[PDB]
Each structure stands twice: as C-alpha cells, then as structure tokens.
C-alpha cells in the first residue's frame, strides 16, 4: 500500500525523515485487530468508517459523539483516508462528556469495561486501547491503566499537553503502558508536549488532519492526536505478527526513528514512531 498526498502524520510514520507526502504500508492494513477509543465517542455513521466504527459503550445520556475529538482520533486510528490502520474495528467507549470532561469513576470504569469487553469482540490479531484522555496524577487511574495492559490490551496514553514531566499526569505516568509524545512535522517535539522518563515513543501530535463530527474532517494539535497514530500502528503491527499486546511498546521503541527529533530534554527518550514497511 501507498496512499499519496496523505496527512503529514501518516506519511511521517512510514518515513525515516520528514518531508514525504505519501503513506506506505502492508496490504494487511489492520484487518482483524480491534481498537478501543476511550474519549467522547464514535460518530460511526461517518462515510470514512465504512461500518468499522461503533459505540460499544457509553456512560452518559447517548452514544452520540458531540465533541468531535472522540471521532477525530477514531479516524486517526481506523479511518480509510485519515487513519493509520485502515481495516481495524473501532470500539468506542464514551467516558467523556461534550463539556470536554469527566470523572475518574467514569474514566476508570472505561478502562475496565474494556478489560472485559475485549472478550465479547473478536480480535484474533490483538486489541489496542487508546487513552484519549489525561488529568493530574492519580494512583487509581494508573492502576486501571496497568490492569488493562496486564490484561493483554495494548494501551497508548497521551503524555499530556502541559509542557511538563508527564510523571505528574495520569494515566500517562503508569510504567507498564506506552506513553506517547507529540512531534511537529519538522521533527521537533511539539510545544505543548509533555516529556521525561516515562514517555516511550513520539508521534505526530501536531496540525493533525482527521475525521470530525457531521461528515467533516478537521485538524487539531495535541499529544492525544499523537496516540491514535501509535495505537493505529500498534494495531497495524499486532495484526502483522510482529508483536503481541505486551510486546507492542517494546517493539515500537526497538523499531522507531532513533535520534530523529529535536527539542528533546534530558532523560526524555529521543525516538519517533516508525512503521517499518519496507515497501
């Protein structure tokens, strides 16, 4: 595969450099892994999702996505035009309101609806969860994240958008998961992006074009945009044999673009999510 004049995010993860405008990948393309987008929900009726998106769970009045973010990121996972893994199912938990917010009661319950619900679904390839969310540090929410990973669900968390050591932010801080940071298109860790010991890989977080509520397709920045790429790739890869739910992060890191970002602090890993598709 070889989708051209692609978003900058997708093209980048297929490329050892920035400055390429075409996305390259395997014909597998996510067919048979599943991904759990944990955020404001999936507008599954989007023409981009071709039936692959759905609302498995919602802790609020409706499954309905009325922010866009849950849809946006969902696209970056498994949209056909904007997404990393273009043949994967997309299982929406709606843990967050349209105010743009929620509780750890819900958040955690979302982590843990999935730890089970994965069962109910079919992913002979493996499952990926996207923590499209983060707050201050809290030791429940981190436990949850672990539990979820512990339970064979490849977890991807945004490092955060506070321009701080992630360690003061959860679920990002949890050792077991893959904590993701953002890069701007010129191989620069993005301004908002958090950092430090904990972070695993980097992704495209910046200017990221993807799906949106009401048929549209817009472009927002954030380290929560970074992650569905990584979950996307995780799911793209776990589908390929190349790794297991546990081994994703440790693979993605072993396979990344080494010393291929700048504006990287001390400690903080210098690696960038690479898909490794020698086309």
UniProtKB/Swiss-Prot annotation:
Residue ranges of every copy of the Peptidase S8 domain listed in the record: 7-279
Free-text comment on the cofactor: Binds 2 calcium ions per subunit.
Domain of life: Eukaryota
UniProt GO MF annotations: metal ion binding; serine-type endopeptidase activity
Binding site for Ca(2+) 2: 16, 260
Gene Ontology CC terms: extracellular region
UniProt entry keywords in alphabetical sequence: Calcium, Disulfide bond, Hydrolase, Metal-binding, Protease, Serine protease, Signal, Zymogen
EC top class, as a word: hydrolase
Disulfide bonding pattern of the chain: 34-123, 178-249
Name this polypeptide is given: Proteinase K
